[PDB]
Structure 1
Amino acid sequence: KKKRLKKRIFAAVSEGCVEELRELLQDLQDLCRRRRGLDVPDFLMHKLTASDTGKTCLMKALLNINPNTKEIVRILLAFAEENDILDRFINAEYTEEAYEGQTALNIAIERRQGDITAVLIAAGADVNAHAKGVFFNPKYQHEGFYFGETPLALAACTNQPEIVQLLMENEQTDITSQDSRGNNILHALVTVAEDFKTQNDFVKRMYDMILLRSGNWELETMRNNDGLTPLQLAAKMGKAEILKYILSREIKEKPLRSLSRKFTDWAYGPVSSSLYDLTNVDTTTDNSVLEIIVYNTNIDNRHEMLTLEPLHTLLHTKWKKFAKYMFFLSFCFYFFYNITLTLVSYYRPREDEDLPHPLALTHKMSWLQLLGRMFVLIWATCISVKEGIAIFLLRPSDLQSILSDAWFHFVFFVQAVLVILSVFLYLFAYKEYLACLVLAMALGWANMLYYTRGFQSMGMYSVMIQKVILHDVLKFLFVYILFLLGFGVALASLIEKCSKDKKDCSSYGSFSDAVLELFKLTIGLGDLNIQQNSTYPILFLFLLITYVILTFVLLLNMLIALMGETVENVSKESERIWRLQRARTILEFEKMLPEWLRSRFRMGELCKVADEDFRLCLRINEVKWTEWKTHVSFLNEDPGP
């Protein structure tokens, strides 16, 4: 095409040079003179825009930047103004698939140029643009930076408060606008705002700024293409610090304190009562906040989120009024359950009826000695149906929570089924009649570890059991097998190859007996009679002493293996795992609670500002001392009769 005009400009634009560019303009003005069938638009947009990427001359002026860019934007605008093509020039996009809608306004906000940005808006740049390129990236950590693709959110995402102050004063700016993911702007701040504390933290300061700049309540009711409110999106993404704002959000004004989530009942000196607006927070709607915090597995800091005041005292009140008494009730049922399996099989009052059958319901039984056998058959089937529904529900949780929680759904289910399969085994009478019963009884007492939740230090001990058995027993066992099998070959010279003095007359297993008589020492159930040889018992015992010392050092380092911030981390994480593993039980009990008579918490519906008396459901607290202020909040009283 002999494009000696186009590439000459884009270099001179990248230089930012003015005087060389002014020469390039009058040559192009004469080049516009040479043909006038398509006068300005379709000739200059073949000259000012790259072919493949669609990168224009103005975006090239904003990728590279030097102190002549404050002038060279004006010249490239006045060139489009003198040629009356500015609207398709100020609002041109990448035709490239990776940057679909990266406009010149986005790339000017991207380079954080506040003075140049106001010129482009005054030149008529599209403020409601959308950049739908491949920078969305499910593989997020590289080439990503999702920001909700609008020019308003991009200044909102990249700490540009003055440009947000500029863009939201433009009346053409669609603040309520959505994304390809359905995200509005408050979704976009949620999906960026990290759980780093105070990175001169701008997002919470700017999430604050957008709602107070403009907006009714009809912005956080907007759902994305997952159907999530920005409160729910802040919970599902687990961004804790932005969610400490949304659940508090006290607004001390009176045009727009209706947007506030925290209120005041009354204020009287250093004692004051706080009220929470609590709409989607409580487990009363579909996919509530506690529904999407506590059942979530993906995020790390669930405990850092449930410490927050609207979630905390609500979880305490569900605990005290409701879930404590069901837990003790479901304790005493499943505890009398396991006593019954112990008192049916292994009781034998006097002289049982010639190898009986445990769960049998024979012709004459007094109604104290077989109703317990009915009590097992009911409450095993009651458990077997319950987590059988959890097969239909917990499809992704089990593999993602590979060690943390929801194992106790399984171990209850395996224990309940093997009781029932022992009854199915009776109807066919195979060899494993007693075998499937006892593993059902052994798990039944091992299942009481699920009821070791409930006391504040009891599960905090029980989680430390679940930590060592899952993580660090297989650590120790793989080394302990190793020196076992290491010295065991060294010991099994002194069996079957050495003196032995009387042996090859006892049972079997030359290597196996040498292992086991070295393996009984860790119990302390030590045998001397296996060692009677000829003059090698000098060499036997000093070998076997170096087993005990070596398997002391494996034991002594095992205590140090749990050490390393045991003053903090082994104690505190086992506490915070426990509080999450008890808060998941409580919301599970509300699924167990029938829909009728939830006449419970969710306190009285006092006014907010508006004409309706009952506006919203509430939650009352008791906040405290210093940093006084002369309050202008609410009904100035004590709470009332």
Structure 2
Amino acid sequence: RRLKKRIFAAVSEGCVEELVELLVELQELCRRRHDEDVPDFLMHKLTASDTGKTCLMKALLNINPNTKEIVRILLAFAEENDILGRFINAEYTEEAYEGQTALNIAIERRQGDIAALLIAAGADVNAHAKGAFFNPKYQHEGFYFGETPLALAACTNQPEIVQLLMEHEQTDITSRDSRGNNILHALVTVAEDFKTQNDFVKRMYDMILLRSGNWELETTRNNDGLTPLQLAAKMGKAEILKYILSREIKEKRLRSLSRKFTDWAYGPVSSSLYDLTNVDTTTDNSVLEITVYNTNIDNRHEMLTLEPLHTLLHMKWKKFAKHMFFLSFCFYFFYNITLTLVSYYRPREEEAIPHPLALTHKMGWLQLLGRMFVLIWAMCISVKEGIAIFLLRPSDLQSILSDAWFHFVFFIQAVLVILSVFLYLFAYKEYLACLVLAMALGWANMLYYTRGFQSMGMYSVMIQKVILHDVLKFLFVYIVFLLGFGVALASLIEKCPKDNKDCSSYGSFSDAVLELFKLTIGLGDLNIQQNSKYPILFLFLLITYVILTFVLLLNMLIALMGETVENVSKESERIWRLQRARTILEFEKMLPEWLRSRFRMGELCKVAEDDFRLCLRINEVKWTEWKTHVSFLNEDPGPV
């Protein structure tokens, strides 16, 4: 084009001597041009007209030893022509970079010196790169950081640029974006575990919060209605949680920005106070509630190890959840005994016209009481579990097994009763089959109530794992052999002579499959003479079945469990507290308002001037790094 493409090259390969000669020619064209269409024209020449890109952008996307000199010349040239208000603050247009600017490029490309120049020249420090690349939908579609220059410098570990932007006086640190996320929401979004990144996101989290000096940021809710604290519990960032939930700011004049407070300390003994503002379930969407009910993450059982939550679970147990767990046991325990006895001691003779659970002929005070309590408590589970199964809305398959299995069996156990209670006086005679399943299901379910005890609870966690990792693999392969060798052995058995009808026990498929099952469990006798056409061939398939099943698969099953027990034993305690935590909160959601208030946690403490907060007292003993206790709330240690 004889003006355009010659400049975009000169800024790229580091061509100073050429670039100067190009911009002089760019003036000579304009000395003939009027003094009104200068600014609108110079932009179209230093602009690509399809992407919105300019030459200051192209200069910084291609870094070189002469970048910093190209920036001096171009920004200088913008000054004489009076275009240093839209040239430095130019943005893309296409679809996926809408809002990205030269400052946005300088910060990522790690030119803090050039970034300082652009801000001094009047670069907008509050741009919003809102393009699709800057708001992906699949990580491995792009990169999200919060759309702001301050968030990029923080999310990319550039502390010197992060400090420079905050000191600038127009930097709106409290700015929100398309997702509603401010600077702190975005750091929670990009955080990762320590082996992946480093602890720098935690350090940027501290630096920006202290420099601000208020609770405005952590109080801000995003478009989904979430604070940075709630957002961390949802997305699963334990390292950032452990920082917030136990934050100490020793610097008086910033101590009110804390959540951990040293009430008193005398030597190695200390007493800390943990704020419970939006952690306890007094509010709608608390940290505790997210931690227990978030089925989208796979590290919940690490979260309830954090001290304010862990102590908070233990106290809810000591006060009301332990006692309710004992009552729920007793009502469900006598519930199954009643199902047992109305059934086992039914009127078998007379063809059982006065069905069990009838509420019929006269009375007797055990005959009447029992049959009422069942049909009521049957409906009570069905409604409760009917609601409960509907709320969580099973999305994936790992959740119902890991969070909801016992909820279904009680739904099934309750409906089988009610299915029976219909079929008694209304329809066919299969009511009995539904009632016998209800109790055998009912009695085996009692492993649920083991979880009040740690020892039996951890034991129950391992039963769950060993079934899903070992048994279902085992049962599948065993059946392909059991039915395969079964029909093969049954296919050989001749018709019995009419003299002896019972010439063989493999006379059919169902007969052979049963007898092979008997061998595996060690029950019965084994006669090789079975009226077969090919006896040595008949023995061959049988002994073959023994070697695969008796020698290999059964004993192999024991060996694979030992591998399961070894790996799972290091995690069964924390998974137990997760299931236990779910039990405590479900009890807690049932209690009325007046009974909820008296069992409210924490005591009201004065952590600062006119800042009365509810906190949790936890005592500690520390011997290692002694210090002079300067920060505290009460100089007289001890209670009261």
Give the TM bin, normalised by the shorter chain: over 0.9
| Change over 3 Å in CA distance of 1:608–1:140 after alignment to 2 | farther
Q: TM-score, normalised by structure 2?
A: 0.94
TM-superposed CA distance for 1:176, in Å, is 0.5
SS at match of 2:571: helix
**Whole-Å separation in 1 of the counterparts to 2:368 and 2:636:** 60
**Whole-Å separation in 2 of the counterparts to 1:189 and 1:618:** 28
| Change over 3 Å in CA distance of 1:570–1:432 after alignment to 2 | same
Contact 2:88 2:102 in 1 (8 A): yes
The alignment yields a C-alpha RMSD, in angstroms, of 2.6
Residue number among 631, 634, 638 corresponding to 2:632 in the alignment: 634
| Change over 3 Å in CA distance of 1:51–1:243 after alignment to 2 | same
Deviations 1:491-512 (A, max 9, x none): 2244237999955668996232
TM-superposed CA distance for 1:635, in Å, is 3.5
| Change over 3 Å in CA distance of 1:84–1:510 after alignment to 2 | same
**Whole-Å separation in 1 of the counterparts to 2:455 and 2:258:** 38
| Change over 3 Å in CA distance of 1:301–1:354 after alignment to 2 | closer
Deviations 1:236-291 (A, max 9, x none): 00111011101011111111110111001100111101101121011110110111
Contact 1:197 1:241 in 2 (8 A): no
SS at match of 2:388: helix
| Change over 3 Å in CA distance of 1:562–1:323 after alignment to 2 | farther
Q: Is 1:193 matched up with 2:191?
A: yes
SS at match of 1:54: coil
Greater displacement, 91-100 / 346-355 = 346-355
Greater displacement, 99-108 / 625-634 = 625-634
Residue number among 220, 223, 227 corresponding to 1:222 in the alignment: 220
Contact 2:145 2:152 in 1 (8 A): yes
**1:179 equivalent in structure 2:** 177
TM-superposed CA distance for 1:434, in Å, is 1.1
**Whole-Å separation in 2 of the counterparts to 1:603 and 1:507:** 69
TM-superposed CA distance for 1:5, in Å, is 1.3
**Whole-Å separation in 1 of the counterparts to 2:532 and 2:183:** 86
| Change over 3 Å in CA distance of 1:574–1:557 after alignment to 2 | farther
Alignment of 1:171-570 (within 5 A): 171-197=169-195, 199-348=197-346, 356-396=354-394, 399=397, 401-496=399-494, 502-503=500-501, 510-528=508-526, 531-533=529-531, 539-556=537-554, 558-559=556-557, 562-563=560-561, 565-566=563-564, 568-570=566-568
Contact 2:274 2:616 in 1 (8 A): yes
Percent sequence identity over matched residues? 95
Greater displacement, 147-156 / 402-411 = 402-411
SS at match of 1:274: strand
**Whole-Å separation in 2 of the counterparts to 1:44 and 1:527:** 101
Unmatched segments (≥5 aa) in structure 2: none
Contact 2:273 2:615 in 1 (8 A): no
| Change over 3 Å in CA distance of 1:619–1:50 after alignment to 2 | farther
TM-superposed CA distance for 1:425, in Å, is 1.8
| Change over 3 Å in CA distance of 1:95–1:324 after alignment to 2 | same
TM-superposed CA distance for 1:411, in Å, is 1.5
TM-superposed CA distance for 1:457, in Å, is 2.4
SS at match of 2:270: strand
Greater share of helix = 2
SS at match of 2:272: strand
Q: TM-score, normalised by structure 1?
A: 0.93
Number of residue pairs aligned between Structure 1 and Structure 2 = 639
SS at match of 2:371: helix
Greater displacement, 608-617 / 258-267 = 608-617
Deviations 1:114-143 (A, max 9, x none): 111111110111001101011255542213
Contact 1:216 1:259 in 2 (8 A): yes
| Change over 3 Å in CA distance of 1:206–1:351 after alignment to 2 | same
**Whole-Å separation in 2 of the counterparts to 1:561 and 1:110:** 53
Unmatched segments (≥5 aa) in structure 1: none
| Change over 3 Å in CA distance of 1:301–1:402 after alignment to 2 | same
SS at match of 1:535: coil
SS at match of 2:271: strand
TM-superposed CA distance for 1:441, in Å, is 1.9
TM-superposed CA distance for 1:598, in Å, is 2.1
**Whole-Å separation in 2 of the counterparts to 1:417 and 1:567:** 35
SS at match of 2:619: coil
| Change over 3 Å in CA distance of 1:433–1:493 after alignment to 2 | closer
TM-superposed CA distance for 1:311, in Å, is 0.9
Contact 2:389 2:407 in 1 (8 A): no
TM-superposed CA distance for 1:573, in Å, is 3.3
Residue number among 103, 107, 110 corresponding to 2:105 in the alignment: 107
**Whole-Å separation in 2 of the counterparts to 1:604 and 1:402:** 34
| Change over 3 Å in CA distance of 1:612–1:384 after alignment to 2 | same
**Whole-Å separation in 2 of the counterparts to 1:636 and 1:490:** 85
| Change over 3 Å in CA distance of 1:170–1:400 after alignment to 2 | farther
| Change over 3 Å in CA distance of 1:585–1:90 after alignment to 2 | same
